[PDB]
Amino acid sequence: AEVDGDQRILIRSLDYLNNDIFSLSRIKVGLDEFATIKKAHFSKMVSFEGPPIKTGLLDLTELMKSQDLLNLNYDNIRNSNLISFSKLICCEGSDNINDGLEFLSDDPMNFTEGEAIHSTPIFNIYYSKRGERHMTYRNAIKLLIERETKIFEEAFTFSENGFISPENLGCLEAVVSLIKLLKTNEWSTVIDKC
């Protein structure tokens, strides 16, 4: 006999199923099925050119052009350097770090765990496994900001009272005025952003 075989996937069916999912490269066409886009290495992200994207204090275009901060490993992002994060600063009036940072992924990453093998030549194997909930891009960036910035604050207390003191503040306006009036240099830019 002949019957109109039910289509395994319906367009309205997928629209409802993805209510919970907000992933551009991941969709669930079926109840348990998943249609995905193949992975590409991020070293090619340099080849993108466009206008800046100003979300709070973060410039996503510079993140696309960034090389140090695009690593998928959580430890390599939580242990990075301020000079790398200083490239992503387009504040223009942002009061809080968190308000700027809320424009970053909150999903867990993968982290590289290393374990010994216990052989005659002792060697360690490192493998990437999905991290727990507390290891996300936002958390890694927050840790990087707070740990490195403390190293910058304690290292720029020209005044004895501290970074927040009015005299140290005055020295800061002096320095930034000097760099604004002077010709721009990447040393000057990195100090300014930090």
């Binding site: 190293i151 290292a155 720029f156 005055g170 306006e173 040393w187 000057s188």
Partner: peptide, 30 residues
């Protein structure tokens, strides 16, 4: 401090060089 000791010195030296090529009390007063 080792991470910023070079960067700050280079920044100051380049600013001195630029301002020369163009041609304490300060903290207390602020």
């Amino acid at each position: 401090i080792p991470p910023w000791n070079v960067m700050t010195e280079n920044f100051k030296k380049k600013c001195i060089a630029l301002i020369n090529s163009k041609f304490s009390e300060f903290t207390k007063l602020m």
